[PDB]
C-alpha cells in the first residue's frame, strides 16, 4: 500500500497537483513522517472491530477541506481482500458520484421532506464516511489474512 | 321592470363564483396527489369526482332558483 | 391647494437643504468613517509588520 | 405489515414487519402505515417509536435517515 | 334561438302525450336497442367487435363500483349505468345535423329532439330510485342504519346531527337538479348557438356537450354509489 | 316591483359561494392525506364528510330561504 | 316594498361567506396533519371542532339575526 | 329603463370571476405535478381537462343565460 | 323605509367574512403545527387563541353595530 | 339615465377578475415547475398557454358583451 | 331615509373583512414558524404583533369612520 | 344624470381587482423559481413577462372603457 | 341625500380589503422566512416594512378620499 | 344628488383591493426566496420592486380616476 | 369643530403670501441644522452623547443603502440622508401638542399646523426632487439609455415597455401621495381621537402613529435609492 | 383651547411610557456601540 500510495503521489505531482495525506494506522503514519509528507490528520490505535465514530476524526476533516476548496479531490488507498491468500492494494475515488450504475433509478420520485437539496447536502457526508468505514473494515480483514 | 331580469342573472352569475374556485382546488389537490403516489389514482378520483360534482350541487342551486325566477 | 409658484419655492428650498447639510455633516461623517476604516486596516498592516 | 429495517452502520437492529412507525422527521414527526407513499427524510435527535400489535418500542435515535417505500 | 319552455307538451295530440324530452327518451331506447342488436348480439368466446365494446363498459363499471362499494349486488348505480347510455344517446342526438332545428315543417315544436332529462320528470324519477336504494342500503341492508340521520344520533355530538340529516335528505334533490340543470342548460346552449349571429361556427358547449353528458352520466352514478356507501358505514 | 325576486337570488347566490370554496378545500385536503397515508383513509374520509356537512349546512340555509322568500 | 325580504337574505347569504370557507380550511388543515401524523389525532380533533364551533358561531349569528329580521 | 342591460352584463361578469380563478388553480396544480415527474403526465392531462370542462360548465352557464337574458 | 333592517344584515353578513376566514386560517395553522412539533403543543395554543380573539374582536365590532342599530 | 353605460363598464370590470387571477396562477405554477425540472419545459409551456386560453376565453366573453352593450 | 344608518354597517363591516383575514394569516404563519424551530420564538412574537398592529389599525380606521357617521 | 361616473369608477375599480392579484402571483412564483434554480433565471423571466402582460391586457381593457365612458 | 355618508364609508371599507389581506401575507412570508434562516433576520425584515408600507399606502388612500367625501 | 361622491370612493376603494394583496404576495414570495438562497438576493429584489411598481400602477389608476371625477 | 383641511396658508410674507408649510419646514431645518453642528462640534474618536447617536444613525442608513447597491451609496447619500432626517423630525413634530390649538393672535387657523409632510405642495416637491435624481443618474450612467423603455421586444413582448414607462411617471405621484396620505391619516388620528373620549384612548394610537411616521420617513429615502438602483441597471 | 391640554396629558404619558420601555435598551445598544469603537482604537494604539 505504501508503494501504491507512494507511486500514486508521483502522477499527481507530475500533473502539477499538490498532494496531502491522511493516514489510518501507525504503519502509514510513521512512513510518511520519515519521508516528509506530514499527514494533515491521522487516526491510530484502531481496534480489530472499530466503530464508524472512530473514523469521523479524519473523515470530517477530509470533507471539510473539500467544502472549503482546500482539496479539489479525495482518494483512499486500502488493502482489497481478493482472497485469503492475496490482498492487493486498491485505490478508490471518494468524490460523490452520479447514480452508481443503475439501482431502482427508474420508477422513483421520493418526496424528499426537508428538501431535495437538504437531503443531498446531508447524505453525501454520511455516504463518504460509509465508504471510508467500509474500506477500513475491509483493510482490517485483509491485514489479519 | 328589469328587477326580475337582474334577479335571474344575479342568481347564476354570483352563485357560481365559489364553486368555480372550489372545483379548481379539488383538481389541483387530486392531481398533485396522484403525481406523488400514482398507485392510488383509483381511490382519489373516486373522491375527486364526488367532490367536484358534489360542489357543482351548490352552483346548480343557482340555476334552479334562476330558472324559477326567470320562468316561474 | 397646489400653487406652482410656491411649489417651486419648496423645490428650491429643499435643494438648498441638501447642499448645506452635505457641506456641514455628511462629508465630515464620511471622512470619519473612511479614516476609521483606513486606521483599522493600518493597524492590520502594523500587526503584520510586528511579526 | 410493512418490512421495517432499522439498519445501523455497525449492525442491523430489526428486520421484522411493523404496523406503524412514529418517525421523528426533521420537518416534523410523521407516522408511517403499511402503504405509505414514497418518501425520503432526515431524522433529528429524538425518540423513534414502533407500534407492534399495540406494543410501543421507543428506540432513541440521535440522527439518521429514512427511506419509506 | 326558437322559444323553449321547461314545459313538456311538444306536438302531442293524444293528451299527456310524448313531448320533446318524453319522445327522445323512447327514441334513445330504440337507439340503444338497435346498438344492442348490432354491437351486443353477435359474440363468441374471444371478445372482438361487438363483444369487445360491451366488455369494456361492463368491466370498467364493475371495477369502479367495486372500488367504492360492492356490498349490495343490486344498486341504483347499475340502473344508472344503463341510464348513462340513455343520457349519452340524448346528448349525441342533441348535436346532430338539423336535430336541434326540428319542427321546421308559428314555428312547430321539436318532439323527439331533446335530451333524456331535459325536464324535471326524468331527473326526479331517477333520484327517487337512487334515494330509495340509499335508504334501503342503510335502513334495510345495513341493519338499523341511519346513524347520523333519522334518530340514531344519541351517541353523536349535541351540535351535530341536524346538519347531517338535512344534508343526507338534500343529497337526492341535488342529484336530481344536477341531471336536470346540466341537460336543460345543454339544450339552451345549443339553441343559443343557433341564435348567434356567427355562421358555420360550432359552439364550445356543443363540442363538449357529449363530454359534459358522458361525465355527468357517470357523476350521477358514482355519487349515488358513494352516498349509498357513506350511508352504509 | 320585482325587488323580492332579487332577495331569493341573493340568498341562493351569496350563500353558495362561501361553502363552495370551503367544500373544495376539504376534498383537496382530504385527497392529500389519502396520497400521503393511503391506510388512514377510513379516518380522514369520515372526518372529511362531517366537515363537508357543516359547509352544506351553512349552504342549505341560504337555499331554503331562497325558497321561503321565493314562495312567501 | 319587499326590501325586508332582501335584508333577510343578505344576513344569511353574506353570513355564510366567511365560515363557509372557514370550515373548509380547518377540515383540510386537520386532515392533512392527521395524514402526516396519524397518532396526533387525539389533540388534533379537539382543536378542529373548537374552530368549527367558533366559525359556525358567526354563521349561526347570521341565522339568528335573520330570524329577527324575518319575524 | 335599461335594467335588463345591466342584467346581461352582470351575469357575464360574475360568471367569469369564479371559473376564471378555478382554471388557474387547475392548470397550476397539474403542471406542478407534471414537473414533479413526466411519466404520469399523460394521465393528468385528461385529468386537467375534465376539471376544466366542469369549470367551464359553470363558465358557460353565465354565457348561456346571457343569451337568454338579453335576446329572450 | 326599511334600510333600518338592511344595515342589520350588512353589519352581520359583512364583518363576519373576515373572522370567518380568519378563524379558520389560524386554527388550521395551529393544528398543522401540532402534527409537526407535538412537543410545543401547549406553547402554540396560547398563541392560537389570542389570534382567535384578535380576529373575533372585529366580529363583535360588527355585532355591536348590528345590536345598536336595531335598538336605535 | 345612461344605465346601459354602467353595464358596459361593469361587464369588463367583473368579467376580468376571474381571468385576472386565472392567468396569474397558471403562469406562477408553470414557472415553478420550470425551476425544479427544466427538462420538461417544452411540455408544460404549451399547456400553460392552453389554460391561459381557457381563462382568457371568459375575459373575451366580457369584451364581447362590452362591445355589444356600447354598440346596439 | 337610513342612508347614514346603513353607512355605519358598511364601514365597520367592509372594514372588518380585510384585516380579519389578514391577521388570520399572521398567526398561522407564526404558529407554523414556531413549530419548525422554537429557538427563534422570542423574535417571531415581536413581528407577529407588529403585523397585527398595522392590520388592526385599518380595522380601527374603519371603526372610527363608522362612529363618525353615527354622530358627524 | 352622473351615472356614467359610476361606470368610470367601476371599470377602473373592478377591472384592477383581477390583474392586481394576478400580477402578484406571477412575480412571486418567478422569484421562488429563480431562488431555487438561478440558472434557469433568464428563461423563466421571459415566460413571466409573456404572461404577466396577458394579465394587464384585461386591465388595459378596463382602462379603455374607463376613457370611452368619459367621452 | 345621505349618499355622502355612504360614500365615505365605502372609501374606508373598500380599499381596506386588499391591504388588510396584503399585510397578512407580508408578515407571514417574512416570519416563516426568518424561522428557516435566522441569520438573515436583520436583512429580510427591512423588506417586510417596505411591503407593509406599500400595502398600507393603498389602504390610507381610501381614508384620505373618505375624508375628502365628508368635507369635499 | 351626491352620486359623483360615491363614484369617487368606488374608484379608490375597488382599485385598492386587487393590488392590495398583489404586492402582498410579491414581497412574501420574495422574502421566502431570500431565506432559501440569500446569494441570489441582489437581482430578485430588482424583480420585486419592478413587480410592485408594475402592480401599484394599476392601483394608482383608481386614485387618478378618484381625482379626475372629484374635480372634473 | 374638528375642521381639518388638506392645505392652509396662514400667509406670513407680505407682497407674496406664503403657505405655512415653510413655517415648519424651517423650524425642522433649524432643528436639523442646530443639532447637526453639535455632532460636528465634537470630533472625538470615541463617540459619546448627541454626536454618538448621529454617528449611529448615519452609518445605519449608510449600511442600508450599501446593501441595495454598494457602487452608488456615496453619490446619492446627501439626498436620501436629508430625506430621512428632515421628514422624520417633522412627522415626530406632529406628536407634540399644539398641532390643533395654536393660532390665536376667533382666528382658529393654526400657524404651526401639523407637519411639513402633511401638505401636498411639500411632498410633491420632495418627490420631484427624488424623481429628477433618478433618471438623471439613469441617463448619466447609461448615456442615451432607454434600453428597457425601448420596447425593442428583445426578451419582452411588444406591449411590455409601455407599461413601466407609465409607472415611471407614477412614482413621483405615488411617492407624494403615500407620504401625504399616511401623515394626513396621522393628522386626523391626532384630532378625531381627541374628539372621542380623549382619556387614555389616543395613547396606543400615538405609538402607532410615531411608528408609521418613522417608517414613511425610512422607506421614502429607501425607495428613491431602490428606484435609483433599478434605473441604473 | 381644551385640545392643547388633551394632547399634553397624553404626550407626557407617552414619553413616560417610552422612558420605561425604550430608554434602557437604546442606551445599552449605544453603550456597546461606543465600547466597541473605543477598544478598537485602543487596540490599534496598542499595536502602534
What's the number of CA atoms in the CB half-sphere (13 Å) around residue J59? 29
Q: Report yes or no on chains C and O touching (3+ CB pairs under 8 A).
A: yes
Q: State whether residue K17 sits within 8 Å of chain I by CB.
A: yes
Q: State whether residue J29 sits within 8 Å of chain N by CB.
A: no
| E174-187: burial string, b at 16+ Cβ within 10 Å, e else | bbbbbbbbbbbbbb
Best D22, D27, D29, D32 member to test I by mutation, with max I CBs in 10 Å, is: D29
Number of H helices, E strands in chain J: 3, 0
Q: Phi-psi bin for D63: left (phi > 0), alpha (psi -120 to 50), beta?
A: left
Task: Find the closest chain O residue to K50 by CA distance.
Answer: O208
Rounded to the nearest angstrom, the minimum Cα separation between H35 and chain L is 12
Residues of F within 8 A of G45 (CB-CB) are: 47
| Interatomic CA distance for residues B72 and O154, integer angstroms | 59
Rounded to the nearest angstrom, the minimum Cα separation between I34 and chain K is 7
Strands D2-3 and D17-18: antiparallel
Residues of L within 8 A of J5 (CB-CB) are: 3-4, 7, 69
Joined together, the cell numbers standing for residue K5 give 344608518
Residues of H within 8 A of B34 (CB-CB) are: 33, 40, 43-44, 47
Rounded to the nearest angstrom, the minimum Cα separation between D51 and chain F is 15
Q: State whether residue M46 sits within 8 Å of chain O by CB.
A: yes
Joined together, the cell numbers standing for residue N38 give 440569500
Cα O58 to its chain centre, rounded Å, is 16
Q: State whether residue H70 sits within 8 Å of chain B by CB.
A: no
Q: State whether residue A143 sits within 8 Å of chain D by CB.
A: no
Crossing angle between the packed helical segments F3-15 and B3-15, to the nearest 10 degrees: 0
Expt. technique: cryo-EM
**Neighbouring residues of K15: CB distance < 8 A, sequence distance ≥ 6:** I15, K58, K59, K61, K62, K63, K65, K66, M12, M13, M16
Strand partners, K71: none
Joined together, the cell numbers standing for residue F20 give 363552495
Query: Are the Cβ atoms of K52 and I48 closer than 8 angstroms?
Result: no
What would you measure as the largest C-alpha separation in chain M, in angstroms? 58
| Interatomic CA distance for residues H61 and E189, integer angstroms | 8
CB O230 within 8 A of CB N49: yes
Crossing angle between the packed helical segments K18-36 and M18-36, to the nearest 10 degrees: 10
Strand partners, A112: D40
Strand partners, D42: D65
| E95-120: burial string, b at 16+ Cβ within 10 Å, e else | beeebbebeeeeeebbbbbbbbbbbb
- What resolution (Å)? 2.9
The count of other CB atoms within 10 Å of the CB of residue O38 is 12
The count of other CB atoms within 10 Å of the CB of residue A20 is 15
The count of other CB atoms within 10 Å of the CB of residue N22 is 39
Q: State whether residue D29 sits within 8 Å of chain I by CB.
A: yes
The count of other CB atoms within 10 Å of the CB of residue H20 is 36
Closest Cβ–Cβ partner in I6, I17, I35 for G40: I35
Ordered alpha helix ranges (H), chain H: 3-36, 41-71
Q: State whether residue K55 sits within 8 Å of chain M by CB.
A: yes
Q: State whether residue F23 sits within 8 Å of chain E by CB.
A: no
Sequential DSSP letters for A85-98: S---EEEEE-S--S
Residues of L within 8 A of N20 (CB-CB) are: 20
Chain O neighbors (3+ CB pairs < 8 Å): C, K, L, M, N, P
Cα O28 to its chain centre, rounded Å, is 12
CB B17 within 8 A of CB F14: no
| Interatomic CA distance for residues G56 and F57, integer angstroms | 10
Radius of gyration from C-alpha coordinates of chain J:
17
Query: Are the Cβ atoms of D30 and G36 closer than 8 angstroms?
Result: yes
**Neighbouring residues of B38: CB distance < 8 A, sequence distance ≥ 6:** H39, H40, H43
Joined together, the cell numbers standing for residue O112 give 404651526
Chain A residues with at least one Cβ partner in B under 8 Å: 109, 111
Residues of B within 8 A of E185 (CB-CB) are: 63
| Interatomic CA distance for residues K56 and O208, integer angstroms | 11
Query: Are the Cβ atoms of L45 and O155 closer than 8 angstroms?
Result: yes
CA pseudo-torsion sign O91, O93, O97, O100? negative
What's the number of CA atoms in the CB half-sphere (13 Å) around residue J38? 13
**Neighbouring residues of M51: CB distance < 8 A, sequence distance ≥ 6:** M22, M26, N23, N24, N26, N27, N28, N52
Q: Per this entry, what is the length of chain F?
A: 72
Rounded to the nearest angstrom, the minimum Cα separation between I29 and chain D is 14
| D16-46: burial string, b at 16+ Cβ within 10 Å, e else | eebbbbbbbbbbbbbbbbeebbbbbbbbeeb
Query: Are the Cβ atoms of E204 and H57 closer than 8 angstroms?
Result: no
Cα→Cα distances F72→B65, E158, G5, G62, N52, Å: 14, 31, 9, 20, 51
Strands in O5-137 per DSSP E: none
Task: Find the closest chain D residue to F37 by CA distance.
Answer: D36
| Interatomic CA distance for residues L50 and L52, integer angstroms | 6
| O106-136: burial string, b at 16+ Cβ within 10 Å, e else | eeebbbbbbbbbbbbbbbbbbbbbbbebbbe
| Interatomic CA distance for residues N44 and L35, integer angstroms | 8
Task: Find the closest chain N residue to J16 by CA distance.
Answer: N18
What are the strands of the beta sheet with D64-68, ordered from one edge? A111-112, D39-43, D64-68
CB N11 within 8 A of CB M8: no
Query: Are the Cβ atoms of A114 and D65 closer than 8 angstroms?
Result: no
Q: How many beta-carbon pairs below 8 A join chains K and M?
A: 148
| Interatomic CA distance for residues O190 and O196, integer angstroms | 11
Amino acid at each position: 500500500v505504501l508503494r501504491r500510495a507512494g507511486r500514486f503521489i508521483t502522477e499527481q505531482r507530475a500533473m502539477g497537483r499538490t498532494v496531502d495525506v491522511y493516514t489510518f494506522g501507525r504503519k502509514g503514519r510513521d512512513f510518511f513522517l520519515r519521508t516528509g509528507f506530514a499527514p494533515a490528520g491521522e487516526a491510530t490505535r484502531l481496534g480489530d472491530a472499530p466503530k464508524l465514530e472512530a473514523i469521523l476524526g479524519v473523515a470530517i476533516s477530509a470533507i471539510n477541506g473539500f467544502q472549503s476548496g482546500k482539496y479539489d479531490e479525495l482518494y483512499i488507498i486500502y488493502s482489497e481482500f481478493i482472497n485469503t491468500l492475496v490482498q492487493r492494494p486498491a485505490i478508490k475515488q471518494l468524490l460523490p458520484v452520479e447514480s452508481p450504475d443503475i439501482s431502482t433509478t427508474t420508477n422513483v420520485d421520493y418526496t424528499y421532506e426537508p428538501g431535495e437539496e437538504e437531503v443531498l447536502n446531508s447524505i453525501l457526508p454520511r455516504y463518504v464516511e460509509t465508504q471510508i468505514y467500509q474500506a477500513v473494515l475491509e483493510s482490517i480483514a485483509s491485514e489479519h489474512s | 321592470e328589469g328587477l326580475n331580469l337582474v334577479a335571474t342573472a344575479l342568481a347564476v352569475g354570483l352563485g357560481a363564483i365559489g364553486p368555480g374556485v372550489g372545483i379548481g382546488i379539488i383538481v389541483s389537490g387530486a392531481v398533485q396527489a396522484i403525481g406523488r403516489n400514482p398507485e392510488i389514482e383509483n381511490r382519489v378520483v373516486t373522491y375527486m369526482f364526488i367532490g367536484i360534482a358534489f360542489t357543482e350541487a351548490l352552483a346548480i342551486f343557482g340555476l334552479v332558483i334562476a330558472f324559477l325566477i326567470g320562468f316561474g | 391647494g397646489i400653487n406652482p409658484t410656491l411649489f417651486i419655492a419648496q423645490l428650491i428650498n429643499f435643494l438648498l437643504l441638501i447642499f448645506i447639510l452635505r457641506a456641514l455633516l455628511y462629508r465630515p461623517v464620511m471622512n470619519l468613517l473612511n479614516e476609521r476604516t483606513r486606521r483599522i486596516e493600518e493597524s492590520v498592516r502594523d500587526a503584520e509588520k510586528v511579526r | 405489515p410493512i418490512h421495517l429495517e432499522i439498519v445501523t452502520a455497525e449492525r442491523v437492529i430489526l428486520s421484522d414487519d411493523v404496523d406503524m412507525i412514529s418517525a421523528p422527521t426533521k420537518d416534523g414527526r410523521v407516522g408511517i402505515l403499511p402503504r405509505h407513499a414514497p418518501l425520503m427524510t432526515i431524522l433529528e435527535p429524538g425518540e423513534l417509536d414502533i407500534i407492534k400489535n399495540g406494543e410501543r418500542t421507543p428506540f432513541a435515535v440521535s440522527g439518521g435517515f429514512m427511506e419509506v417505500l | 334561438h326558437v322559444e323553449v319552455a321547461a314545459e313538456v307538451i311538444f306536438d302531442g295530440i293524444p293528451g299527456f302525450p310524448i313531448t320533446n324530452s318524453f319522445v327522445v327518451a323512447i327514441i334513445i331506447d330504440i337507439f340503444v336497442i338497435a346498438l344492442a342488436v348490432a354491437a351486443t348480439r353477435n359474440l363468441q368466446m374471444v371478445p372482438r367487435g361487438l363483444q369487445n365494446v360491451m366488455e369494456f363498459i361492463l368491466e370498467s363499471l364493475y371495477n369502479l363500483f367495486r372500488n367504492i362499494n360492492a356490498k349490495y349486488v343490486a344498486t341504483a348505480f347499475p340502473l344508472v349505468a344503463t341510464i348513462f347510455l340513455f343520457v349519452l344517446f340524448g346528448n349525441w342526438f342533441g348535436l346532430l345535423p338539423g336535430v336541434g332545428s326540428i319542427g321546421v315543417c308559428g314555428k312547430k315544436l321539436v318532439p323527439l329532439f331533446r335530451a333524456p332529462a331535459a325536464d324535471l320528470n326524468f331527473t326526479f324519477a331517477i333520484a327517487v330510485i337512487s334515494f330509495v336504494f340509499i335508504e334501503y342500503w342503510g335502513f334495510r341492508a345495513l341493519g338499523p342504519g341511519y346513524l347520523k340521520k333519522f334518530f340514531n344520533t344519541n351517541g353523536i355530538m349535541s351540535f351535530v346531527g341536524i346538519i347531517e340529516f338535512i344534508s343526507e335528505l338534500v343529497k337526492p334533490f341535488a342529484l336530481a337538479f344536477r341531471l336536470f340543470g346540466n341537460i336543460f342548460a345543454g339544450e339552451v346552449l345549443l339553441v343559443v348557438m343557433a341564435f348567434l349571429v356567427p355562421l358555420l361556427l360550432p359552439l364550445p358547449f356543443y363540442g363538449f356537450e357529449v363530454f359534459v353528458g358522458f361525465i355527468q352520466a357517470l357523476i350521477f352514478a358514482l355519487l349515488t354509489y358513494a352516498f349509498l356507501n357513506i350511508a352504509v358505514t
